[PDB]
Write an enzyme that holds these catalytic residues in place. Structure first.
Site: not given
Ligand SMILES: O[C@@H]1[C@@H](O)[C@H](O[C@@H]2CO[C@@H](O[C@@H]3CO[C@@H](O)[C@H](O)[C@H]3O)[C@H](O)[C@H]2O)OC[C@H]1O
Ligand SMILES: O[C@@H]1[C@@H](O)[C@H](O[C@@H]2CO[C@@H](O)[C@H](O)[C@H]2O)OC[C@H]1O
Ligand SMILES: O[C@@H]1[C@@H](O)[C@H](O[C@@H]2CO[C@@H](O)[C@H](O)[C@H]2O)OC[C@H]1O
Ligand SMILES: O[C@@H]1[C@@H](O)[C@H](O)OC[C@H]1O
Ligand SMILES: O[C@@H]1[C@@H](O)[C@H](O[C@@H]2CO[C@@H](O[C@@H]3CO[C@@H](O)[C@H](O)[C@H]3O)[C@H](O)[C@H]2O)OC[C@H]1O
Ligand SMILES: O[C@@H]1[C@@H](O)[C@H](O[C@@H]2CO[C@@H](O[C@@H]3CO[C@@H](O)[C@H](O)[C@H]3O)[C@H](O)[C@H]2O)OC[C@H]1O
Ligand SMILES: O[C@@H]1[C@@H](O)[C@H](O[C@@H]2CO[C@@H](O)[C@H](O)[C@H]2O)OC[C@H]1O
Ligand SMILES: O[C@@H]1[C@@H](O)[C@H](O)OC[C@H]1O
Lengths: 436, 436
Positions: B128, B170, B207, B236, B238, B325, B338, B347, B408-409, B412, B430
């Site tokens: 950064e 990075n 991020h 990183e 998420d 359905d 069903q 539906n 599961d139906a 079966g 099923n």
């Molecule tokens: O108290 C401290 C925590 O606030 C600290 O949090 C970590 C902060 O860094 C995180 O990882 C970063 C996320 O943003 C990216 O841009 C960076 O490259 C990453 O390194 C990390 O996940 C948090 O846990 O952790 C230490 C505590 O003492």
């Molecule tokens: O409709 C259901 C079936 O799909 C179900 O099938 C079982 C699934 O787990 C397997 O380990 C069994 O061998 C297999 O028979 O059984 C219950 C029925 O209501």
């Molecule tokens: O610690 C850093 C964060 O401060 C940083 O935060 C970003 C700031 O710009 C926003 O648009 C983003 O959504 C927000 O995540 O992200 C990286 C982290 O290392």
């Molecule tokens: O939901 C079903 C419907 O989609 C069908 O057309 O008729 C029977 C109903 O049970």
């Protein structure tokens, strides 16, 4: 005061609460939101069996009182949770069975309600007493094994302990009318009313997720119970994913049933949730309002006069007349959007998702690379970030969930090519937009 | 070899690495993934200036060799990071200037590379050195003030220290060809190569995020540097939100450049990332492979024989010849999918998104209610949950990210109405699908 959930809810005679965790009351960010948004409080764990009776016969209300005191000091009513339950029982109670357990159950109810007599609006007397196996029967627990009549006994005991309190039966997976559990609780409540068993309310926890999803028939479920002569309450609301539509739907269902007293979301911020992984609440970690918060508030305020754009649609600003448009219909990440005359072109067709996104091209999201003023509004691959979520305020503005800023046309320019940026919210026509 | 990233990369003579943190080498879930997936290693911090020279003249390679040894014993080459940089310099260096500093830089480069002489594949000698102001010029650092020629000296010094090592420059934000910084680095390297300055490689941190988005011209940048006669490396990598398309794109950019040595992602799991909030890696915290993981693996293996669909397509079962359905085109959450005779209808139109979702109707997502065999596969409002993210394996199977199970139906089945469930991947027909 239609600007906060509680005050908005109050416009329909209802309340909007949350579950408070006493251990978070020292968190100013937490209390600031809690105090401002809700007028009803439930102790998340402080009033449960193990917290209130650590050892048999020894009651402890220090934890529960911390929640209670904070609630009244901030003008909130309180829902007591919960008196009889198979879960979170102190060790000494888990080892009990039969008559010994039955009496301990009764002794516990008298002790806790006595301490809070006349101070609790609703008490979840019995919690989760029905099974999930699918037959709608009773859950097999040490309590149920004392006899089928244990719930009835708990309610009679509670009524005598504090007649001023509304006695509720609380449970989950009882929101879908088609589920057997739901019908089982209905039959019990109906049986209670018919024989004169003391019960005033049914709490529907409302913990919705893809496993047990919200279903519009929830309104009927509510009406069905309401028709039995009891109030109903959404007591522990949270939705996996926090769909804006689902949150709005649930709110409208409660508002549709006159006997629905209010809604309590189980927690303040997603981070406070017992299921944070499901990001099921109305506020996120940093305390900002999620898209679903806006949908809930708007729903409480009566919703909007006209229906939002169903699939697709253009965003036209009032102070320009132009539509939000991506320069040259580009699909390159990092492309700042602009204002431009409206027309049928995908690069001008944005979709507002239940997650609060403004998508274009189907997989590109309105994105803000920053939170301060001047930040350029661009398009970026949709990934769910808060900088890709927006709230559509009733005033026609669009605020960034993460930034809290409003979509702003640079220099208030109205001419084509005018870039879009993030700037402090105002009310200028260069920040209001109209769905179409 | 094609089941792991390193192996797939090896097929084309490239590598796929990661950044290793010495403190995590004792974590078996960490090393199980690291040793299996990568064939190249970069110490995340252990080989930086402050860590290797805590005091001028006295080198401490303990932490560094720890990583280096683990790498080699596990069949991985190593990238040294980094020799000269304005960041993470020990206290004594951050105060040096002019000549003494220039000499300090040289001695440091000599000491570290000396110790690792002949053991390092690539060394980020300079990191950064350009600013982000937009001038395209050097960054003002104590190192730069010692003379514009410091970068040249570092490289000449490095080549001397260890000629067997590829020397890299990075940096970040040098991926977009149109950026001045990128050009600044391009001209320096061009100059270096002409005057003979010893530099073998340019590292692109890569991020990518909304602030500095990936751009397809990145391949142009890599090709332009490669033309200068230097190797290039993605050092990183998420990607914010880890879009499958972007991950696949960066991978193909490297495969398209004969001089691109390999790709390194900055970390193993999203929870290990220095920017976890951006969930920018290939593995989830629970260790499960993300949708992007499969996109990279497929890309490294030569992609699919046929150009994959571009949003809104059909997913047909191989054993049944029938399509995925949604019954009666329902849009209600919880509706299980069903198999049904293929036909043009929404539906049956599934869109695979960068996030890994399979959307229908625009805002509905293929959803797994649980994680065990038999779990119903259904539709639910889209919200970004892992139970709504899938991996498109090259063998035609579709695996749930959260569960690790395949679509599961049931039994079966092949007839219309056969339901879809999750089940242990079996390679059965099923569980195989073709997208068109
Ligand atoms: O108290 C401290 C925590 O606030 C600290 O949090 C970590 C902060 O860094 C995180 O990882 C970063 C996320 O943003 C990216 O841009 C960076 O490259 C990453 O390194 C990390 O996940 C948090 O846990 O952790 C230490 C505590 O003492
Ligand atoms: O409709 C259901 C079936 O799909 C179900 O099938 C079982 C699934 O787990 C397997 O380990 C069994 O061998 C297999 O028979 O059984 C219950 C029925 O209501
Ligand atoms: O610690 C850093 C964060 O401060 C940083 O935060 C970003 C700031 O710009 C926003 O648009 C983003 O959504 C927000 O995540 O992200 C990286 C982290 O290392
Ligand atoms: O939901 C079903 C419907 O989609 C069908 O057309 O008729 C029977 C109903 O049970
Ligand atoms: O503590 C309580 C939890 O245990 C309780 O969990 C609920 C369990 O059921 C879940 O829905 C299931 C989905 O799969 C079906 O096959 C089952 O029949 C359903 O019951 C529900 O989503 C969970 O919340 O929730 C309430 C807590 O107090
Ligand atoms: O270790 C204990 C925790 O596991 C415990 O968690 C609480 C469990 O109950 C949660 O509230 C319930 C949610 O589901 C509803 O159906 C119930 O009615 C609620 O009571 C609460 O939110 C969790 O915090 O808390 C106590 C810990 O010791
Ligand atoms: O760079 C400048 C912007 O910062 C400036 O922003 C305006 C500030 O006042 C607000 O009322 C306006 O809505 C907002 O656009 O605009 C000019 C531009 O050059
Ligand atoms: O994006 C704009 C496009 O929508 C319009 O049609 O032509 C001008 C472009 O800048």
């Amino acid at each position: 005061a239609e600007s906060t959930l509680g005050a908005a809810a109050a416009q329909s005679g209802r309340y909007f609460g949350t579950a408070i965790a006493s251990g978070k009351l020292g968190d100013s960010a937490y209390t600031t939101i809690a105090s401002r948004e809700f007028n009803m409080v439930t102790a998340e764990n402080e009033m449960k069996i193990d917290a209130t009776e650590p050892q048999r016969g020894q009651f402890n209300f220090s934890a529960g009182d911390r929640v209670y005191n904070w609630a009244v000091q901030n003008g909130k009513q309180v829902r007591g949770h919960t008196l009889a339950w198979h879960s979170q029982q102190p060790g000494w109670m888990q080892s009990l069975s039969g008559s010994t357990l039955r009496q301990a159950m009764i002794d516990h109810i008298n002790g806790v309600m006595g301490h809070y007599k006349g101070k609790i609006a609703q008490w979840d007397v019995v919690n989760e007493a029905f099974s999930d196996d699918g037959s709608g029967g009773r859950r097999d627990s040490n309590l149920q094994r004392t006899g089928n009549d244990w719930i009835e006994v708990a309610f009679r005991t509670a009524r005598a302990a504090d007649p001023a309190a509304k006695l509720c039966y609380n449970d989950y997976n009882i929101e879908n009318w088609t589920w057997a559990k739901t019908q089982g609780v209905y039959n019990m409540v109906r049986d209670f009313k018919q024989r004169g068993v003391p019960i005033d309310c049914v709490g529907f926890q409302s913990h919705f997720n893809s496993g047990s999803p919200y279903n519009s028939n929830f309104r009927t479920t509510l009406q069905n119970f309401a028709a039995l002569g009891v109030d109903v309450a959404i007591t522990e609301l949270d939705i996996q994913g926090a769909s804006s539509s689902t949150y709005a739907a649930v709110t409208n269902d409660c508002l549709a049933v006159s006997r629905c007293l209010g809604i309590t979301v189980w927690g303040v911020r997603d981070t406070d949730s017992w299921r944070s992984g499901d990001t099921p609440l109305l506020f996120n970690g940093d305390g900002s309002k999620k898209a679903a918060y806006t949908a809930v508030l708007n729903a409480l305020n009566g919703g909007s006069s006209t229906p939002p754009p169903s699939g697709g649609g253009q965003i036209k600003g009032v102070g320009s007349g132009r539509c939000l448009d991506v320069p040259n219909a580009s699909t390159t990440d990092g492309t700042q959007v602009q204002l431009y005359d409206c027309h049928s072109a995908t690069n001008q067709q944005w979709t507002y998702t239940d997650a609060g996104e403004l998508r274009v091209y189907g997989d590109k999201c309105l994105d803000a690379a920053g939170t301060g003023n001047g930040t350029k509004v661009q398009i970026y691959s949709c990934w769910g970030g808060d900088n890709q979520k927006w709230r559509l305020n009733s005033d026609g503005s669009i605020v960034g969930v993460q930034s809290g800023l409003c979509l702003d046309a640079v220099g208030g320019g109205t001419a084509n090519g005018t870039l879009i940026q993030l700037y402090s919210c105002s009310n200028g026509s260069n920040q209001r937009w109209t769905r179409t």
